[PDB]
Design a protein around this motif. Structure first.
Motif, PDB file in Angstrom:
ATOM      1  N   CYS A  42       0.883  -1.199   0.000  1.00  0.00           N
ATOM      2  CA  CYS A  42       0.000   0.000   0.000  1.00  0.00           C
ATOM      3  C   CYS A  42       0.907   1.232   0.000  1.00  0.00           C
ATOM      4  O   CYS A  42       1.737   1.360   0.923  1.00  0.00           O
ATOM      5  CB  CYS A  42      -0.955   0.043   1.192  1.00  0.00           C
ATOM      6  SG  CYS A  42      -1.995   1.532   1.243  1.00  0.00           S
ATOM      7  N   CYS A  46      -0.259   3.394   3.389  1.00  0.00           N
ATOM      8  CA  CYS A  46       0.022   2.932   4.779  1.00  0.00           C
ATOM      9  C   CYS A  46       1.145   1.885   4.824  1.00  0.00           C
ATOM     10  O   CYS A  46       1.411   1.389   5.930  1.00  0.00           O
ATOM     11  CB  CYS A  46      -1.244   2.406   5.450  1.00  0.00           C
ATOM     12  SG  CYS A  46      -1.934   0.915   4.676  1.00  0.00           S
ATOM     13  N   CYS A  72      -6.069  -1.133  -0.992  1.00  0.00           N
ATOM     14  CA  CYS A  72      -5.794  -1.529   0.413  1.00  0.00           C
ATOM     15  C   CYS A  72      -7.118  -1.843   1.111  1.00  0.00           C
ATOM     16  O   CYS A  72      -8.142  -1.262   0.709  1.00  0.00           O
ATOM     17  CB  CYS A  72      -5.073  -0.428   1.176  1.00  0.00           C
ATOM     18  SG  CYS A  72      -4.274  -1.008   2.692  1.00  0.00           S
ATOM     19  N   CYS A 114      -8.742   1.958   4.285  1.00  0.00           N
ATOM     20  CA  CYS A 114      -7.648   2.830   3.770  1.00  0.00           C
ATOM     21  C   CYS A 114      -7.825   3.081   2.268  1.00  0.00           C
ATOM     22  O   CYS A 114      -7.541   4.212   1.831  1.00  0.00           O
ATOM     23  CB  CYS A 114      -6.279   2.217   4.041  1.00  0.00           C
ATOM     24  SG  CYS A 114      -4.961   2.902   3.004  1.00  0.00           S
TER      25      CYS A 114
HETATM   26 ZN    ZN Z   1      -3.254   1.040   3.222  1.00  0.00          ZN
END
Ligand code: ZN
Ligand code: AR6
Ligand code: 08D
Length: 282
Positions: free
Chosen positions: A132, A135, A157, A161
């Motif tokens: 991702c 994140c 994700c 997210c």
């Molecule tokens: Zn993420």
């Protein structure tokens, strides 16, 4: 691509005759016993016996390109089985004889072998892994992620997210993941034994990491059929199929090479399993 310097490709193989090979693997046995912090550095030579060609071997990707020929695969990445070497390295970590594993391989076979991700640096990334962008959450997939060169895979994700997911496969221009490189570097400096396995050590900075073990008085073992950039800085060179070397090494260490259950991901190393008592060396 074109511009990329793909180094020396297709150098001749060396075959240590049996008496010298048996002696050198005993000496590798001695160094593993004598050592507190053993770090292993792998490259594409440890997957050749799984049907995956290497880069600079006689029939390597680059070598065959240079002769207008194609590398040949005897498996898919998905159907590739971890080698005897891959499974030796799992047991050596499980019994507390391997501190860290630094790999240039993108073939995903360390991870699928059951090798703990928190003791693995995958310097060139992992074909089964997407990350991702938002994140930094990594997913290990059962199939290869469709793209290379840190591109969008077309998946999002799913952390508690909707981030853009990208492959982890470095292009030539792309620099290494800092987390993996810093831990690789750290293990490599701290090591008192670095063992290289089916890498030619021609790629900066991956190929230089074994040499950091030399500073502060650590030993270097290079196992490889072809010469390597740093053959000179090695206290031991073994010209042999890495599976024969590791199966003999394991046999000398009193360790069994464990069965492969099929693809499994272990995130964190479990505390060490028993291991045999050490022979009297000196
Ligand atoms: Zn993420
Ligand atoms: N069964 C075997 N036993 C021992 N050595 C072997 C065996 N099969 C092959 N070898 C040796 O294994 C060596 C493999 O070395 P290279 O082919 O350079 O692979 P890398 O991992 O260093 O490639 C680094 C990066 O370069 C690329 O651009 C990618 O980015 C890679 O990640 C050869 O010397 C073989 O003789
Ligand atoms: C670089 C580069 C080439 C490439 N092509 S590849 O076909 O994905 C490949 C991956 C690993 C091995 N051992 C051989 C070929 N992947 O990264």
């Amino acid at each position: 691509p074109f511009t990329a310097d793909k180094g020396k490709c297709g150098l001749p193989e060396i075959f240590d005759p049996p008496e010298e090979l048996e002696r050198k693997v005993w000496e590798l046995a001695r160094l593993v016993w004598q050592s507190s912090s053993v770090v292993f550095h792998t490259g594409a030579g440890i997957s050749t016996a799984s049907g995956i060609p290497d880069f600079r071997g006689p029939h390597g990707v680059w070598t065959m390109e240079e002769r207008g020929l194609a590398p040949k695969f005897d498996t898919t990445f998905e159907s590739a089985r971890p080698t005897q070497t891959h499974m030796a390295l799992v047991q050596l970590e499980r019994v507390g004889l391997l501190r860290f594993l630094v790999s240039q391989n993108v073939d995903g076979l360390h991870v699928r072998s059951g090798f703990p991700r928190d003791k693995l640096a995958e310097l060139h990334g992992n074909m089964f892994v997407e990350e991702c962008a938002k994140c930094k959450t990594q997913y290990v997939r059962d199939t290869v992620v469709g793209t290379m060169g840190l591109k969008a895979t077309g998946r999002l994700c799913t952390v508690a997210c909707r981030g853009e997911l990208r492959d982890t496969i470095l292009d030539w221009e792309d620099s290494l993941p800092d987390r993996d490189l810093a831990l690789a570097d750290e293990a490599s400096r701290n090591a008192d034994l670095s063992i290289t396995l089916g890498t030619s050590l021609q790629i900066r900075p991956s190929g230089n990491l074994p040499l950091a073990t030399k500073r502060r008085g650590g030993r270097l073992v290079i196992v490889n059929l072809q010469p390597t950039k740093h053959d000179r800085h090695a206290d031991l060179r073994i010209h042999g199929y890495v599976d024969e070397v590791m199966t003999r090494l394991m046999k000398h260490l009193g360790l069994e090479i464990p069965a492969w259950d099929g693809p499994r991901v272990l995130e964190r190393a479990l505390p060490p399993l028993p291991r045999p008592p050490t022979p009297k060396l000196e």
